[PDB]
Design an enzyme around this catalytic site. Structure first.
Site, PDB file in Angstrom:
ATOM      1  N   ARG B 177      66.876   9.590   8.996  1.00  0.00           N
ATOM      2  CA  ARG B 177      67.352   9.383  10.363  1.00  0.00           C
ATOM      3  C   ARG B 177      67.920   7.961  10.460  1.00  0.00           C
ATOM      4  NH1 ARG B 177      62.194   8.464  14.700  1.00  0.00           N
ATOM      5  NH2 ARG B 177      61.653   6.413  13.817  1.00  0.00           N
ATOM      6  N   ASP B 242      60.328  15.438   6.063  1.00  0.00           N
ATOM      7  CA  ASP B 242      61.193  16.020   7.085  1.00  0.00           C
ATOM      8  C   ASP B 242      61.071  17.535   7.265  1.00  0.00           C
ATOM      9  OD1 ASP B 242      62.751  13.903   8.242  1.00  0.00           O
ATOM     10  OD2 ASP B 242      64.312  15.490   8.394  1.00  0.00           O
ATOM     11  N   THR B 243      61.047  18.269   6.166  1.00  0.00           N
ATOM     12  CA  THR B 243      60.883  19.712   6.236  1.00  0.00           C
ATOM     13  C   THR B 243      59.617  20.070   7.019  1.00  0.00           C
ATOM     14  OG1 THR B 243      59.782  19.632   4.062  1.00  0.00           O
ATOM     15  CG2 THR B 243      62.123  20.254   4.136  1.00  0.00           C
ATOM     16  N   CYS B 348      60.889  25.696  -3.711  1.00  0.00           N
ATOM     17  CA  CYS B 348      60.082  24.550  -3.392  1.00  0.00           C
ATOM     18  C   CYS B 348      58.804  24.450  -4.225  1.00  0.00           C
ATOM     19  CB  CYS B 348      59.721  24.592  -1.906  1.00  0.00           C
ATOM     20  SG  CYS B 348      58.683  23.213  -1.392  1.00  0.00           S
ATOM     21  N   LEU B 349      58.710  23.366  -4.978  1.00  0.00           N
ATOM     22  CA  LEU B 349      57.589  23.143  -5.871  1.00  0.00           C
ATOM     23  C   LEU B 349      56.374  22.759  -5.055  1.00  0.00           C
ATOM     24  CD1 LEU B 349      56.906  19.880  -6.411  1.00  0.00           C
ATOM     25  CD2 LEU B 349      58.929  20.055  -7.881  1.00  0.00           C
ATOM     26  N   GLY B 350      56.631  22.385  -3.806  1.00  0.00           N
ATOM     27  CA  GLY B 350      55.576  22.039  -2.863  1.00  0.00           C
ATOM     28  C   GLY B 350      55.136  23.181  -1.947  1.00  0.00           C
TER      29      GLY B 350
HETATM   30  C1  HEM Z   1      57.897  23.833   5.517  1.00  0.00           C
HETATM   31  C2  HEM Z   1      57.939  22.946   4.503  1.00  0.00           C
HETATM   32  C3  HEM Z   1      58.968  22.973   3.354  1.00  0.00           C
HETATM   33  C4  HEM Z   1      60.113  23.668   3.232  1.00  0.00           C
HETATM   34  C5  HEM Z   1      60.803  24.659   4.189  1.00  0.00           C
HETATM   35  C6  HEM Z   1      60.702  23.358   1.968  1.00  0.00           C
HETATM   36  C7  HEM Z   1      61.899  23.890   1.530  1.00  0.00           C
HETATM   37  C8  HEM Z   1      62.440  23.594   0.284  1.00  0.00           C
HETATM   38  C9  HEM Z   1      63.598  24.225  -0.318  1.00  0.00           C
HETATM   39  C10 HEM Z   1      64.456  25.313   0.357  1.00  0.00           C
HETATM   40  C11 HEM Z   1      63.806  23.694  -1.535  1.00  0.00           C
HETATM   41  C12 HEM Z   1      64.948  24.096  -2.504  1.00  0.00           C
HETATM   42  C13 HEM Z   1      66.286  23.400  -2.256  1.00  0.00           C
HETATM   43  C14 HEM Z   1      67.246  23.756  -3.390  1.00  0.00           C
HETATM   44  O1  HEM Z   1      67.106  24.831  -3.996  1.00  0.00           O
HETATM   45  O2  HEM Z   1      68.184  22.972  -3.713  1.00  0.00           O
HETATM   46  C15 HEM Z   1      62.785  22.670  -1.733  1.00  0.00           C
HETATM   47  C16 HEM Z   1      62.631  21.861  -2.843  1.00  0.00           C
HETATM   48  C17 HEM Z   1      61.668  20.884  -3.047  1.00  0.00           C
HETATM   49  N1  HEM Z   1      60.557  20.603  -2.251  1.00  0.00           N
HETATM   50 FE1  HEM Z   1      60.133  21.644  -0.507  1.00  0.00          FE
HETATM   51  N2  HEM Z   1      59.891  22.431   1.327  1.00  0.00           N
HETATM   52  C18 HEM Z   1      58.799  22.194   2.149  1.00  0.00           C
HETATM   53  C19 HEM Z   1      57.720  21.402   1.865  1.00  0.00           C
HETATM   54  C20 HEM Z   1      57.550  20.610   0.737  1.00  0.00           C
HETATM   55  C21 HEM Z   1      56.405  19.788   0.431  1.00  0.00           C
HETATM   56  C22 HEM Z   1      55.137  19.783   1.314  1.00  0.00           C
HETATM   57  C23 HEM Z   1      56.664  19.116  -0.713  1.00  0.00           C
HETATM   58  C24 HEM Z   1      55.841  18.121  -1.577  1.00  0.00           C
HETATM   59  C25 HEM Z   1      54.777  17.490  -1.121  1.00  0.00           C
HETATM   60  C26 HEM Z   1      57.988  19.509  -1.141  1.00  0.00           C
HETATM   61  C27 HEM Z   1      58.622  19.048  -2.263  1.00  0.00           C
HETATM   62  C28 HEM Z   1      59.795  19.558  -2.797  1.00  0.00           C
HETATM   63  C29 HEM Z   1      60.404  19.120  -4.041  1.00  0.00           C
HETATM   64  C30 HEM Z   1      59.982  18.000  -5.028  1.00  0.00           C
HETATM   65  C31 HEM Z   1      61.628  19.998  -4.201  1.00  0.00           C
HETATM   66  C32 HEM Z   1      62.621  19.935  -5.377  1.00  0.00           C
HETATM   67  C33 HEM Z   1      62.292  21.114  -6.284  1.00  0.00           C
HETATM   68  C34 HEM Z   1      63.379  21.360  -7.307  1.00  0.00           C
HETATM   69  O3  HEM Z   1      64.551  20.976  -7.040  1.00  0.00           O
HETATM   70  O4  HEM Z   1      63.097  21.997  -8.376  1.00  0.00           O
HETATM   71  N3  HEM Z   1      58.488  20.432  -0.240  1.00  0.00           N
HETATM   72  N4  HEM Z   1      61.966  22.648  -0.599  1.00  0.00           N
HETATM   73  C1  CAH Z   2      67.135  20.262   0.203  1.00  0.00           C
HETATM   74  C2  CAH Z   2      65.781  19.603   0.151  1.00  0.00           C
HETATM   75  C3  CAH Z   2      64.851  20.580   0.794  1.00  0.00           C
HETATM   76  C4  CAH Z   2      65.354  19.264  -1.094  1.00  0.00           C
HETATM   77  C5  CAH Z   2      66.396  18.268  -1.631  1.00  0.00           C
HETATM   78  C6  CAH Z   2      66.340  17.489  -0.293  1.00  0.00           C
HETATM   79  O1  CAH Z   2      66.616  16.313  -0.147  1.00  0.00           O
HETATM   80  C7  CAH Z   2      65.742  18.393   0.708  1.00  0.00           C
HETATM   81  C8  CAH Z   2      66.322  18.257   2.131  1.00  0.00           C
HETATM   82  C9  CAH Z   2      64.284  17.969   0.618  1.00  0.00           C
HETATM   83  C10 CAH Z   2      64.182  18.408  -0.886  1.00  0.00           C
HETATM   84  O2  CAH Z   2      63.068  19.047  -1.131  1.00  0.00           O
END
Ligand code: HEM
Ligand code: CAH
Ligand code: CAM
Ligand code: FES
Ligand code: CA
EC number: 1.14.15.1
Lengths: 106, 405
Positions: B177, B242-243, B348-350
């Site tokens: 932001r 943010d997510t 999402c790995l999270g």
């Molecule tokens: C409602 C909560 C969340 C949503 C909707 C969400 C959604 C997503 C999505 C759609 C992606 C894939 C984007 C792509 O394919 O380019 C992603 C990737 C990722 N997220 Fe989440 N996320 C959430 C929470 C979290 C949390 C809690 C963590 C870690 C503490 C996290 C860590 C990551 C990381 C490191 C990636 C990169 C994975 C990769 O590129 O292989 N996320 N997330």
């Molecule tokens: C697209 C993403 C969800 C993914 C790469 C970004 O910066 C996100 C906005 C947060 C991360 O996990």
């Protein structure tokens, strides 16, 4: 229906798995940590690898091209009965299905 | 504003959509995006907005493209392209086989086994925050709960001190932001600069926190470098902020307007996990994409090397071809399909941490504040982008209706 997951060390866990649920999903939902399911079930990571007991291999629908491709890169020994368990969808026909879980996924 | 139509894009596939400013935003962001799924809109369209790019409008296509990284590369996953200029977090921009190496290491940090044992602390953090807001009869949920919850969870996970939160909040806020007071690249650099001495210290004095595990890990058959470690530790932070903030905000905005849905989860708390999956479907919020590695015909459309294609995670779950009555929230929905966490190897790995945060928040909130509403005269404003969100969420409640536990 029931699925039996046999860990590498011979520990057996029996799960109630509902129709339409993948064997990866049921494992990950219930603490079967030796199935990782990293990609979330689209035959994209090979971390839900299992050996399907030969009593059930003619009951489970055959692996598609994608699964076959993804299986190439499993890190434990690839075997004739290797499947990605995210690609095995539970149905009543499979009640009793036994799968063995390798000692590694990553 | 509007880019020229490249010679290979036919005018009949052109559609008017700015992902940063969709027309019916005031109806809500998911509603505004659903225009892409109106009766006669093609499964795959081109917009002149934001440099010009493709948009897959339907779940079937979105999933398919995410499952084919050979044609649809993550090397350039953001629109506009210049938006990821100084973006180098790991492993967002990698394809397998290398991306898998990093995911293996990340799984040691936020995998299911780690989340399961983390749960008691997550609950304590949620409970403390909620109990501190309860007597007031009001909060801005976004700033008072949604923001502090995930960042404190990260400090815990990463073995970092609470006194460091204001600095980290500031940097990630600047990235996400922006104020004008600092560029994204400056804020990124400052985050990495905070991380990297902690990385190096813990490579030599290891612990059991996330930074130690990442710092001591192996990728590609050799030790992870400090640079790679900081670039992935950076995303374990930014990825979880943010997510989560925005998704929890959409959910609570919804519950504040839906006393029957609140009552369902109060009377039957065991439904909260299922309810949480349906809220992830309905209030899906991410929209990134991929870049074409070569000329490729996909579903009858000629795509060219270098074209960017937005593959919005948000749309799969709203797709009426995948869920009947997609705008209706039904906690008993039989076959909840979505791609809210993404799809393919980058899913999402999270995800397990996110789900636990959602589930704990809802149970710990509803237990103490079962009755709440949007502040009267409050104009709740959504924002649209790669991570769509809620600007602010003023909630109000009668403290007489609340309970400490
Ligand atoms: C409602 C909560 C969340 C949503 C909707 C969400 C959604 C997503 C999505 C759609 C992606 C894939 C984007 C792509 O394919 O380019 C992603 C990737 C990722 N997220 Fe989440 N996320 C959430 C929470 C979290 C949390 C809690 C963590 C870690 C503490 C996290 C860590 C990551 C990381 C490191 C990636 C990169 C994975 C990769 O590129 O292989 N996320 N997330
Ligand atoms: C697209 C993403 C969800 C993914 C790469 C970004 O910066 C996100 C906005 C947060 C991360 O996990
Ligand atoms: C909007 C984002 C989430 C993503 C990571 C940083 C960010 C601000 C970008 O420009 C890309
Ligand atoms: S969970 Fe990724 S291939 Fe099965
Ligand atoms: Ca520096």
């Amino acid at each position: 229906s029931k699925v039996v997951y046999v860990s590498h060390d011979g520990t057996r866990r029996e799960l109630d798995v509902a129709c339409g649920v993948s064997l990866m999903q049921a494992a990950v939902s219930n603490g079967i940590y030796d199935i990782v399911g990293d990609c979330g079930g689209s035959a994209s990571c090979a971390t839900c690898h299992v050996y399907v007991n030969e009593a059930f291999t003619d009951k489970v629908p055959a692996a598609n091209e994608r699964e076959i491709g993804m299986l190439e890169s499993v890190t434990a020994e690839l075997k004739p009965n290797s499947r990605l368990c995210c690609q095995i969808i539970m149905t009543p026909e499979l009640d009793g299905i036994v799968v063995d879980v390798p000692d590694r996924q990553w | 504003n509007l880019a020229p139509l490249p010679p290979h894009v036919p005018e009949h596939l052109v559609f008017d959509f700015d992902m940063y400013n969709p027309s019916n935003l005031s109806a809500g962001v998911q509603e505004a995006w659903a225009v892409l799924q109106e009766s006669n809109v093609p499964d795959l369209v081109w917009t002149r907005s934001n440099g010009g790019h493709w948009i897959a409008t339907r779940g079937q296509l979105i999933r398919e493209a995410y499952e084919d990284y050979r044609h649809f590369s993550s090397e350039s996953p953001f629109i506009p392209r210049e938006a990821g200029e100084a973006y180098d977090f790991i492993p967002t921009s990698m394809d397998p086989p290398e991306q898998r190496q990093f995911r293996a290491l990340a799984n040691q940090v936020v995998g299911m086994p780690v989340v399961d044992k983390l749960e008691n602390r997550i609950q304590e953090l949620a409970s403390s925050l909620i109990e501190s807001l309860r007597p007031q009869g009001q909060c801005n949920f976004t700033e008072d709960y949604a923001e502090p919850f995930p960042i404190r969870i990260f400090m815990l996970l990463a073995g970092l001190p609470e006194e460091d939160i204001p600095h980290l909040k500031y940097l990630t806020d600047q990235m996400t932001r922006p104020d004008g007071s600092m560029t994204f690249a400056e804020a990124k650099e400052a985050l990495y600069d905070y991380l990297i001495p902690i990385i190096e210290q813990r490579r030599q004095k290891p612990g059991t926190d996330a930074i130690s595990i990442v710092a001591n890990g192996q990728v590609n058959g050799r030790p992870i470098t400090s640079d790679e470690a900081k670039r992935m530790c950076g995303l374990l932070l930014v990825g979880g902020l943010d997510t989560v903030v925005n998704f929890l905000s959409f959910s609570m905005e919804f519950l504040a307007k839906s006393p029957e849905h609140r009552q369902e989860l109060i009377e039957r708390p065991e439904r909260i996990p299922a309810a949480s999956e349906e809220l992830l479907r309905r209030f899906s919020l991410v929209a990134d994409g991929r870049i074409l590695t070569s000329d490729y015909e996909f579903h009858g459309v000629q795509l060219k090397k270098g074209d960017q294609i937005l593959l919005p995670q948000m749309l799969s779950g709203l797709d009426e071809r995948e869920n009947a009555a997609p705008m209706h929230v039904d906690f008993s929905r039989q076959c909840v399909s979505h791609t809210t966490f993404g799809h393919g190897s980058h899913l999402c790995l999270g995800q397990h941490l996110a789900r636990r945060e959602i589930i704990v928040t809802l149970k710990e909130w509803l237990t103490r504040i079962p009755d709440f509403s949007i502040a009267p005269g409050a104009q709740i404003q959504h924002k649209s982008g790669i991570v769509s969100g809620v600007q602010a969420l003023p909630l109000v409640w009668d403290p007489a209706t609340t309970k400490a536990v």
